[PDB]
């Protein structure tokens, strides 16, 4: 993922969206490893699916 | 002795230098006021 989408300024925390319904102890902690793991999983699943049939 | 200890922090983090400017000014103006910076970056005031 970081090969295809290099991020020098570490802005990946900005787009990521988490549940504001829970308290701060209960929300997702937006740690560097976990934010990039989540984006990499999503990107891999998104590459599975041709844009002409559907997308995520 | 100054033993009462209060920690301050700007609301906009980008506004941090102005606060530091302000801190030096209160340090000149109150004779026994102490200002420290901790390891974790808190700015601390000691007063009575």
């Amino acid at each position: 993922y970081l090969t295809e989408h290099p991020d020098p300024n570490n802005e990946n925390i900005v787009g990521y969206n988490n549940k504001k319904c829970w308290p701060r102890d209960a929300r997702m902690r937006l740690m560097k490893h976990d934010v990039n793991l989540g984006r990499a999983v999503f990107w891999d699943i998104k590459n599975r699916l041709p844009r002409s049939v559907t997308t995520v | 002795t100054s033993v009462i200890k209060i920690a301050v922090e700007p609301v906009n983090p980008s506004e941090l230098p102005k606060m530091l400017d302000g801190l030096r000014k209160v340090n000149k103006s109150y004779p026994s006021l102490t200002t420290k910076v901790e390891e974790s970056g808190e700015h601390v005031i000691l007063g009575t």
Binding site: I45, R48, L49, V53, T54 | -
Partner: protein
């Protein structure tokens, strides 16, 4: 049976009309048909086989 398949696919190809405007549907499905739910589930099955593998 190919007769039923022709009936379902041909049934999606209709003129849609609200008030003075009308056009032919030729691309997507019309979700308000009675058997549309079947189509979605069956077509969704194909998308599942893309996201998984055949093996998984």
């Amino acid at each position: 049976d190919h007769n039923i398949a022709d009936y379902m696919t041909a049934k999606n190809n209709v003129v849609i009309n609200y008030k003075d405007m009308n056009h032919t549907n030729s691309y997507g499905i019309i979700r308000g048909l009675q058997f549309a739910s079947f189509i979605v589930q069956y077509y969704g099955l194909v998308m599942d086989l893309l996201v998984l593998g055949l093996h998984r």
